[PDB]
Every structure is written in C-alpha cells, then in structure tokens.
C-alpha cells in the first residue's frame, strides 16, 4: 500500500510536467504574434 | 547498519558456507556545479557502483534510462536489497544484458547493457551485492550501464522514473564499515560534565581531541579550521594513534562513562566502578574495557545459562574461581552489577596478582584471564606468555580485542609491535577494506592519505 | 538419539503408530493455509497502469 | 507503535518537501529555457 | 562556614560523596513541588538518607571542593533523580 | 529516554 501511494505520488509529478511543457510552445507563439504584429 | 535504501518501507548440509560477494561501501556523487537537469542542487545520489569507482564514473552531464558511463570491467553493485526477478538477454537494440531486482523499497530496478551476470533469478540479493559487469552493447568503444527504476515489471516507458531525482529524495546509508579505532584521549563522555563541544556523528575521531568533516580539520572548542589536505599530507598521513597500556592519569574521576551507555545510564554503578579502581590501584578505564568484554557489553552480566561452560559474572567468573571466593556461579550470575563490583576487588585483591595491576592494562587482563600463573609467567618471561604461535585463545588476542566496541586500541609494549608495522601502510586512493577510507567518504572529506586500517 | 528428534521420530513406537495420520494432515493443513495465504498475496500483485 | 507512526510522519512529510523542491527546480528550468528562446 | 538551608520541604533521597571534579558533597532533596534540588560542594552533612525536612531546614555547610580558598554552592533543580544535564532548569529563573 | 547510540564499530 505504502508503494502504491508511492507510485500515485509520482504518477502526479509526471502529469503536472506534462501539462507545464506547454508552456514553451505558448510563450513562442507568443513571441511570433509579437513580431507579427 | 543497514547498507543503502533505509526507507521505512523496508524495515518490515556438511559443506563449507563462503559468504556472498557483497561490498561494504557504495558510490556516491555530489553535485556542487551548475549542470542542472531537474535534480535538486547539492544532494547525494547512490551509484550503483563500488565507492573505489565512484572517481571513474561519470553521470553523462535520450530515453527513460540514465546512462552512467564507466570503464571497462567495473562490477555493477545492487543499492538496495531485493529479490531478483529475471535475467535474460535481449540481442539488438535495448537492454542487451539486463537484470531485474525487485527492491524491499518498493520499486523495481533494472540495470542493462551489461557483460555477464553474477546473479541468478529468484535468488534473495543484500544491498552491496555484486550483479555484474557493464557493458558496450549501445556504443562499442565505450562502456556503460543503462540504469531504469520503475513502480512495476513491464518493459515499457509507462512507469519509468528518473533513477537520480528517486535516489536524491531516499534515506540511504552509503557506508556499513564500522569507524576506524584509535585513540579517544579526549573523546570521553562524563555524565555529571558532559562535554561542551560536540561535532556531527559522521566525524573521523582523531586523536587528541581532533576532528576531520567537510575537508576540513581543527579540534573541539575551536573555530579555526585548518584545510585537511594541508596539514594531513604523505609525509604526516591521517594516524587515528593508539592508547598508551600504562599511561594514566593517576585519578580516577566518578562518572566517567568512557565512551559505554552503560556506564551512562548506570550512575550508581560508575560510581562503585570508579571506586573500585582507585583502590585496586589501577586506571577505571582498563577494567571497564575488560569487564565490557566479558559481558558482551554489559549485556550478559547477570546471565546464568550463556555460558556452555559455567562463566558468569563482570570478569568472567569460573566455577573454580566462584569456590574460592566462597560463593556459587549462579549466586555470582543472580546478583546486580554493582554488588558484583565488590567480588571483583575481592578476587583482583589477591596478592599473587594485586602488586603487579598497576604496571599496565596487560597485567590486568593476564589476571583475569589465566589468573596467578599466567601473571607469573608475565612476570618471568613478557614476551613468552604473548607468543601467537596457534592456540588463537592467548592473550594477545585478548588484548587486540579490548576496547572494541567504542573504538580504543590499545598499544601494549611486547605485543603491538606486529600491529604497528603491519599498520605502517599509506593510502592515497580508496581501498574496499580500509575502515579509514569509508570514514573519510562519509564524513565528506576527500580521500586523503592516510595509515591502513583494516581487519 | 538428537539426530532422530531431529526429524520426530524419537517418540516410543506406541507413541509414533498413535501419532501419524494425525501428524501427516496436520503437515497437509498446515500447508494448505501457507498456499491460501501465498495465493491471496500473489493474486494482490497487480499493476496499476 | 508512537515511534513508527513518528517515523513514517516525518518521511511523509520529508517526501511531500523533496517533492516540492523538485517542481520548484523543473518551474525555475522551464523559466530559464523560456528566457533562452 | 555558612550554613546551607533547605527552601522548600521533602524528602533527603541520598547524601553522598564523589571526590574529584563535580558533586563533592551533594545532597539531593526531594520537594514537595514536585522538582528535585541538589546541593552540591558541601562541607558537612546535616540531614540523613530518608529523612523527611521541612521548610528552612539546615542542610550542611558550604564548601570549596572547585576553588580552594574561595568557598561556594552548587546549586541545581531538576525534574528528575539522574546526574545528567537532560532535565536542568536554572534556578534563578525556576524561583523567579 | 536513555542516552547512547547503538555502537557503529563492530562488537
Ligand atoms: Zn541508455
Ligand atoms: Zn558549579
């Protein structure tokens, strides 16, 4: 049971870096539409 | 000491037994630069290589798996004790050799790309245990070890976790040796003045009241700090010394614990102790060595049925010995420490022995160990009744093991002469069976040189 | 004499032609619980992926 | 049984804290690769 | 010469001796507080093991076990019966 | 509690 809470724990982890990596593709998007205009 | 993960998870036929291939200390590796990859700044992580290697290996600065670059023929070392699951090979692409260990903590550890195994599956692997040798199955040329951890046994990237940022947030023990003994002509613990200045436990306690940690050197009580690789050098490497057998204060002083709890949690008793060698005559601290080991540290002293032979009390009490004294061995087994302090001053009065207590630690354990005729022996030829030839229950041994258990040897004239040329040996680099070398990896400091300590 | 109460068989022989049957499915029971409980622990080992 | 419940407290606690310097040091990288580009 | 007097009322639980550094003649009373006052580097004993003082008591006379020739007390509160330093309160501030 | 340390050098 320890070893499950465990694994939830770290399965947590990966998915919020998983949502934070859009964050480069936002910003540089960002960056081109300010170029652009 | 447990070796590696220490997590509480993992808390819960007439032929010759050779022990398993298992190591006492583990390659760690601490970051002190900027080359970041998520891992947090200044934490250690446990290789799974031998701590002689941790030099030699490199962390590599794409996949699931980290890569730890190595030389050719190191010897894969498992962290964590476990079951190994399977060891099979897998000829192409990934995992050429790879083996499996299902660690206590909770989580599976393979480790792949390797050379040849050195387990089995289904075998029970302790932490140190060696697994195997890396291999260059990915990039010929150049040795590696692809290290994967995972929550589960499958084979996928579903499940993976990045080895160095799991070991950088696990309580872990790097080193099982136990500390190098030496001197403690300083490191005394007195219950009624406990000492005022205090150092971390993973400290190197040299002699005089000196310390190593972090690299750097200095004593108790002072703030100045000297560099460890300035002071310590080839010419004057790190000696932990020796206590002198026949050099003592001359005052015994009432709740001087010397270093043993039960000295500590037993006031009382240090009391009677420290009475007791002031009127033998004799320094407390050699009968408390003594009386230490003959009871297994103070826990076998009122214990009746131990002994296959019929020895009880603090120094050993035979059924002869209890006869002449005018008691039994098991009246002797039944009394308290302290009442059995005043048989002891009793036997060690006799005056075929209690001249001679005050010339040396030696005497003392002669006395108590063979009693009159070993002492007349000693008295009549010194270096005849220390004489190594077989037997392996003479007193020289006797002497070599007193003070063990807090870390004092001592330097008896007639008998250490083997030790200290022996001894004379200088470090420079790790060595596997050198207690000095693990204490100077756990107390931080680097490998500096240093007198061979071994066992 | 130690050697055979080693195994058990160092009772008198009334003793030991009494005790059997009794022993074996005592041995058989014992066994089958250590198995129910091995079953019930490896059939908890599941993944959770 | 007040000693191990101590003790598996203050891993929890110690784990939950690692787990929060770690997200701390991934948000400072990803701040930094954003500054980068 | 002066003479050591016991502020609260108990039980003496030991009158001893230890030559040497620490605690040359001390007596432990047990108070009625409920804390444990110790009186060291003595010179005579006045009470007895066991004996039951009340409030302003002549426990013995003051000594200079430590610095010869200038004479002081060990004075020292506890909440327990050990020799140790795990468990001391200065007295100032405990009679404060 | 008491005081003391389990011993790290063997016994
Ligand atoms: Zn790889
Ligand atoms: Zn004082």
Not at chain 1, 7 to 32: D, G, H, K, P, V
Not at chain 2, 91 to 99: D, E, F, S
Not at chain 2, 290 to 311: L, P, Q, Y
Not at chain 3, 25 to 49: F, H
Request: hydrophobic fraction near 35%; charge should be positive; glycine fraction near 12%.
């Amino acid at each position: 049971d320890q070893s499950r809470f465990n694994s939830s724990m770290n399965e947590l982890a990966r998915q919020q870096n998983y949502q934070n990596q859009t964050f480069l593709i936002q910003r540089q998007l960002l960056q081109e539409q300010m170029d652009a205009e | 000491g447990q070796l590696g993960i220490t997590s509480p998870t993992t808390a819960l036929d007439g032929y010759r037994r050779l022990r398993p291939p298992v190591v006492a200390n583990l390659a760690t590796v601490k970051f002190t630069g900027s080359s970041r990859n998520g891992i947090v700044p200044g934490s250690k992580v446990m290789l799974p290589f031998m701590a002689a290697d941790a030099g030699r290996v490199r962390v590599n600065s794409t996949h699931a798996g980290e890569d730890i670059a190595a030389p050719g023929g190191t010897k894969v070392v498992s962290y964590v004790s476990g079951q190994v699951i399977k060891v099979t090979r897998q000829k192409g692409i990934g995992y050429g050799r790879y083996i499996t260990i299902k660690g206590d903590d909770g989580m599976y550890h393979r480790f792949a790309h390797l050379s040849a195994h050195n387990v089995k599956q289904g075998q029970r692997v302790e932490a140190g245990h060696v697994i195997g040798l890396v291999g260059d199955d990915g990039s010929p040329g150049s040795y590696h070890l692809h290290w994967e951890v995972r929550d589960n046994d499958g084979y996928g990237a579903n499940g993976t976790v990045n080895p160095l940022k799991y070991m950088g947030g696990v309580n872990f023990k790097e080193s099982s040796a136990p500390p190098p003994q030496g001197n403690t002509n300083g490191w005394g613990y007195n219950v009624n003045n406990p000492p005022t200045a205090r150092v971390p436990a993973n400290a190197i306690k040299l002699p005089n009241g000196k310390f190593l940690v972090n690299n750097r050197t200095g004593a108790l009580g002072n703030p100045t700090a000297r560099a460890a690789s300035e002071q310590y050098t080839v010419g004057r490497p790190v000696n932990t010394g020796k206590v002198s057998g026949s050099s003592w204060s001359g005052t015994n002083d009432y709740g001087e614990t010397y270093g043993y709890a039960y000295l500590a949690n037993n006031p009382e008793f240090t009391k009677k102790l420290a009475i007791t060698a002031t009127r033998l005559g004799i320094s407390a601290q050699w009968l408390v060595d003594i009386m230490a080991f003959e009871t297994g540290n103070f826990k076998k002293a009122t214990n009746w049925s131990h002994s296959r032979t019929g020895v009880v009390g603090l120094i050993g009490f035979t059924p002869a010995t209890a006869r002449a004294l005018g008691t039994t061995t098991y009246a002797l087994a039944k009394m308290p420490p302290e009442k059995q302090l005043d048989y002891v001053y009793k036997y060690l009065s006799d005056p075929q022995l209690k001249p001679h207590l005050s010339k040396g630690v030696e005497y003392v354990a002669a006395s108590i160990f063979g009693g009159s005729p070993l002492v007349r022996k000693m008295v009549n030829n010194r270096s005849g009744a220390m004489q190594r030839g077989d037997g392996d229950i003479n007193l020289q041994n006797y002497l070599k093991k007193l003070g063990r258990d807090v870390g004092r040897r001592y330097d008896i004239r007639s008998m250490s002469r083997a030790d200290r040329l022996i001894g004379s040996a200088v470090h420079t680099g790790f060595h596997e069976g050198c207690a000095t070398c693990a204490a100077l990896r756990s107390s931080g400091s680097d490998i500096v040189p240093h007198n061979a300590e071994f066992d | 004499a130690a050697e055979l109460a080693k195994y058990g068989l160092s009772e008198p022989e009334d003793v030991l032609r009494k005790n059997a049957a009794t022993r074996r499915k005592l041995v058989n029971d014992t066994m089958y619980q250590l198995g129910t409980q091995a079953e019930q622990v490896r059939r908890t080992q599941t993944s959770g992926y």
